């Protein structure tokens, strides 16, 4: 929540350089408040579809109920941090991050009024621009993002505020440590959902991811086309494992994330989202030791399209080299050090810095 003050009568005239800046700055604040009020008035295809912010938005609907803001507003009267029990029974962290009401009501307007809409101290106008700036940028973000943003910017939630959110969340000490050392990822997996400007308070819901599975082993499967090496142009056959992507052990099964680009890797930790996963038996790993094993039917696609390509892996490069394409691996100090023969071959990242397949 950000607490605002209603500005009733802006009766300032007088074209004076110092006066004009406060009047124009006050119009920015009023317009921003008004602007926010007008706002209320392969194998990826197997995956299901969720409603990413259904949880956060549902909390937002509860805040529109009668008296729901007064509970929040009264609980955040003495401190900037309080746990509020909502009408539906849900306990929610509340957080007053910016108090513009008291600044305008008790510090700015008295100073402003005293000298007949004239301010004899440039420092007071600037201090207001600094105070006002955050509310202006929150409005700026919500107006181009249609009231739901991701990632949660440092304007919506400063770094220190977010760390305080994490330390007060009902989660494990292991969980808190994980989120705290990776705030850049936590932001990227978070939503900020604008909510209400009711009473004298602006409130938005920040929907943070909670990581219920931590420290289980994960592996990334890279796959590439495997073709015959016949001399006749179209006499060739091709075969590719399609089960490429990320795999993590999870509650006795294996969570499979087909689109590996939706996962973020920081050092050796993989942050994935289970809404983009299929739940598979542990026996999926057998496809790596014996593709013809009888316990799991390993997925593949077949083609007659023998085109050359390369797949960069975590520790090397798979090279599918077919036809007359030139495929090599190079060192920074030595040039070309390996020329690939036709078929699927592999190179480690030890002696190799680049891999060249055709004009790529």
């Amino acid at each position: 929540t950000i607490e605002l003050s209603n500005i009733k009568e802006n009766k300032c005239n007088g074209t004076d350089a110092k006066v004009k800046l406060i009047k124009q700055e006050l119009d920015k604040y009023k317009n921003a408040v008004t602007e926010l009020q007008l706002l209320m008035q392969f194998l990826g295809f197997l995956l299901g579809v969720g409603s990413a912010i259904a949880s956060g938005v549902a909390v937002c609907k509860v805040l529109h109920l009668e008296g729901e803001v007064n509970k929040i507003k009264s609980a955040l009267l003495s401190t900037n941090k309080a746990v509020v029990s909502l009408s539906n029974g849900v306990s929610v962290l509340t957080f007053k991050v910016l108090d513009l009401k008291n600044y305008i009501d008790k510090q700015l307007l008295p100073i402003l009024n005293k000298q007949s809409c004239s301010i004899s101290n440039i420092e007071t106008v600037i201090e207001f621009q600094q105070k006002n700036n955050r509310l202006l940028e929150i409005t700026r973000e919500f107006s181009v993002n249609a009231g739901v943003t991701t990632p949660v910017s440092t304007y919506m939630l400063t770094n220190s505020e977010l760390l305080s959110l994490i330390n007060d969340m009902p989660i494990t000490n292991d969980q808190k440590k994980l989120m705290s050392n990776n705030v850049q990822i936590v932001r990227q997996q978070s939503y900020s959902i604008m909510c209400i400007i009711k009473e004298e308070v602006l409130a938005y819901v920040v929907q943070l991811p909670l990581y219920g599975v931590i420290d289980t082993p994960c592996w990334k499967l890279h796959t590439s086309p495997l073709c015959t090496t016949n001399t006749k142009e179209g006499s060739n056959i091709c075969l590719t494992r399609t089960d490429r992507g990320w795999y993590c052990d999870n509650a006795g099964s294996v969570s499979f994330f087909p689109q590996a680009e939706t996962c973020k890797v920081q050092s050796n930790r993989v942050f994935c989202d289970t809404m983009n996963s299929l739940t598979l038996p542990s026996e999926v790993n057998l496809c790596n030791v014996d593709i013809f094993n009888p316990k799991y039917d390993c997925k593949i696609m077949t083609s007659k399209t023998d085109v050359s390509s390369s797949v960069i892996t975590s520790l090397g490069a798979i090279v599918s080299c077919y036809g007359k394409t030139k495929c090599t691996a190079s060192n920074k100090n030595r040039g070309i050090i390996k020329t690939f023969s036709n078929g699927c071959d592999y190179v480690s990242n030890k002696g190799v810095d680049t891999v060249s397949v055709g004009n790529t």
Partner: antibody, heavy 125, light 108 residues
Framework: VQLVQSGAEVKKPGSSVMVSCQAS????????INWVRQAPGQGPEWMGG????????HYGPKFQGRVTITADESTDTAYMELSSLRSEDTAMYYC???????????????????WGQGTLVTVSS | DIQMTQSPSSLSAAVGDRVTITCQAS??????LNWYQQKPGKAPKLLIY???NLETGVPSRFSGSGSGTDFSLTISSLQPEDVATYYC?????????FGGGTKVEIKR
């Protein structure tokens, strides 16, 4: 702008007194009009204030229920009624304004930057 | 109510001396504090508002400082016409309250 209050007077114990305060040269809509009294040998004491532009009146907890503050915008006079007078009330009663030109809905009195001359009300038989 | 404890109750200093007056509140009042000068028989005159801002036409020798619960009023070069009682006043919340006052007397 000059604030000109009614004259000093003696009031019998138990009756009520009304002090007037004429804002001359300007509107009452432009001010917070406060009433501040000062008994002999004491500091000032804030009794209350009226914010005519907001339709808001505020009285100190010690005085509510026997003080009435009104702002007559037709004659630019604010008034302060004090009922059930006793010996403690013998005091100098000051009308004092704060300019309230840019106001918020939740604006409250803050200071007293323009004063009347004062009305010395003595309560005695 | 918020009680303002003003110190000292009275002081005597020579013409030209630097004089400091203190106001402390029973609770946090940020910098929502004003200072007044009252000479005998006259209404008070506002000297300082929001802890440190000088009223127009008030001598530059006056200054205000402080925040939170402890505040001060400083006169850099005391002059004869400053003989008066000074009061601090908070407005963090209602009712507005005044300090007890500090009477300043001149030693000559």
């Amino acid at each position: 702008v000059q604030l000109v209050q009614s004259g000093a007077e003696v009031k019998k114990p138990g009756s009520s007194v009304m002090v007037s305060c004429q804002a001359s040269g300007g509107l009452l809509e432009d001010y917070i009009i406060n009433w501040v009294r000062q008994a002999p040998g004491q500091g000032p004491e804030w009794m209350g204030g009226i914010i005519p532009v907001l339709g808001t009146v505020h009285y100190g907890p010690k005085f509510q229920g026997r003080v009435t503050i009104t702002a007559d915008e037709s004659t630019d006079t604010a008034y302060m009624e004090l009922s059930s007078l006793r010996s403690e009330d013998t005091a100098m009663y000051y009308c004092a304004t704060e300019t309230a030109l840019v106001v918020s809905e939740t604006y409250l009195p803050h200071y007293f930057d323009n004063w009347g001359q004062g009305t010395l009300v003595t309560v005695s038989s | 109510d918020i009680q303002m404890t003003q110190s000292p109750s009275s002081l005597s200093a020579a013409v030209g001396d630097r004089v400091t007056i203190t106001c402390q509140a029973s609770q946090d009042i940020v910098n929502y504090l004003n200072w007044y000068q009252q000479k005998p028989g006259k209404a008070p005159k506002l000297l300082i508002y929001v802890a440190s801002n000088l009223e127009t036409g008030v001598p530059s020798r006056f200054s205000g400082s402080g925040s939170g619960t402890d505040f001060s009023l400083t006169i850099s070069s005391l002059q004869p016409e400053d003989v008066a009682t000074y009061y601090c006043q908070q407005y963090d919340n209602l009712p507005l309250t005044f300090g007890g006052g500090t009477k300043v007397e001149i030693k000559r």
